[PDB]
Amino acid sequence: RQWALEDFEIGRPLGKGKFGNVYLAREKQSKFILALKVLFKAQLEKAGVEHQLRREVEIQSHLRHPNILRLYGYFHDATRVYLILEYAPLGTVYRELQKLSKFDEQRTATYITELANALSYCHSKRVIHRDIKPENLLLGSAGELKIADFTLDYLPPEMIEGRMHDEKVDLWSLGVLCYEFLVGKPPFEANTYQETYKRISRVEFTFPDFVTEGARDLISRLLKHNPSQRPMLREVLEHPWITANSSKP
Numbered sequence: 001r002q003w004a005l006e007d008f009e010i011g012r013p014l015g016k017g018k019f020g021n022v023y024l025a026r027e028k029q030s031k032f033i034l035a036l037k038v039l040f041k042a043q044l045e046k047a048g049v050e051h052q053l054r055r056e057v058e059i060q061s062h063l064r065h066p067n068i069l070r071l072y073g074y075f076h077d078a079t080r081v082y083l084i085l086e087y088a089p090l091g092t093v094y095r096e097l098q099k100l101s102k103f104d105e106q107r108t109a110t111y112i113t114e115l116a117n118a119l120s121y122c123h124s125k126r127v128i129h130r131d132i133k134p135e136n137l138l139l140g141s142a143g144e145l146k147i148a149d150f151t152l153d154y155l156p157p158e159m160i161e162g163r164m165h166d167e168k169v170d171l172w173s174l175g176v177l178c179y180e181f182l183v184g185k186p187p188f189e190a191n192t193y194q195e196t197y198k199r200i201s202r203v204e205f206t207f208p209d210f211v212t213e214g215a216r217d218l219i220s221r222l223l224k225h226n227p228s229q230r231p232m233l234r235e236v237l238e239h240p241w242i243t244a245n246s247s248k249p
């Protein structure tokens with residue numbers, strides 16, 4: 001179908017990115033609420049990224065999963081690109097974090113679970129190494145998790161350590177996340193980027209004493225240096241800490 005700025009009335013900003021801004025917006029024709037994301041061919045060029053785009057767009061365009069944010073259309077004009085996207089009313093897991101500083105284990109476990117399925121399907125169709133920082137998780141109207149990705153702490157040992165990664169990478173992220181949710185910050189934070197290198201090659205981290213065994217078990221298996229040792233998803237899903245907690249309607 002053919003899109004055009006004119007078929008959208010434009011709403012309030014929801015964020016300003018590097019190449020542009022995302023907005024709330026509605027399709028004049030169905031009154032369909034969604035998000036619009038605005039790029040400037042201009043800044044795209046000078047960061048020569050148009051290559052990074054046109055790919056991921058494609059990719060995205062294809063994917064369909066409840067937990068991954070949808071990309072509906074994309075259209076362009078004179079001097080910026082438009083990206084039509086699903087709107088996620090409840091915002092990002094990143095503010096949710098800032099706000100509760102920390103998540104309880106049911107919330108975490110459940111979010112993991114989503115991720116895991118997401119990650120799985122995304123894998124199935126042969127796609128990997130998403131950045132899944134918390135500011136690339138949005139929330140659905142149900143608080144249903146959902147993901148949208150298009151530094152650092154979330155890189156694994158085999159990537160910083162300039163070596164050979166696969167989709168186990170996705171298992172590490174998931175550890176970091178699960179750690180970050182529960183504790184509040186990510187397990188290899190550090191002040192300079194070179195402490196973080198270090199921290200990550202020795203996988204050097206520690207739990208606060210409020211963190212249950214269930215969790216430390218899981219987390220630990222995910223955060224292993226040898227890609228091969230870490231679980232796989234349906235294992236993770238099948239972990240007990242998870243099943244015990246994962247509210248799953």
Ligand SMILES: O=C(Nc1ccc(Nc2ccnc3[nH]c(=O)c4ccccc4c23)cc1)c1ccccc1
Nearest residue numbers: 014015022035037056057060086087088091148150
């Ligand atoms: O630019 C892209 N991704 C993307 C991902 C998320 C958002 N922004 C939102 C979209 C929908 N709901 C949202 N809800 C929000 O609450 C929000 C808050 C801050 C920033 C963005 C959003 C946001 C905008 C763009 C993109 C590029 C290539 C492929 C796919 C997506």
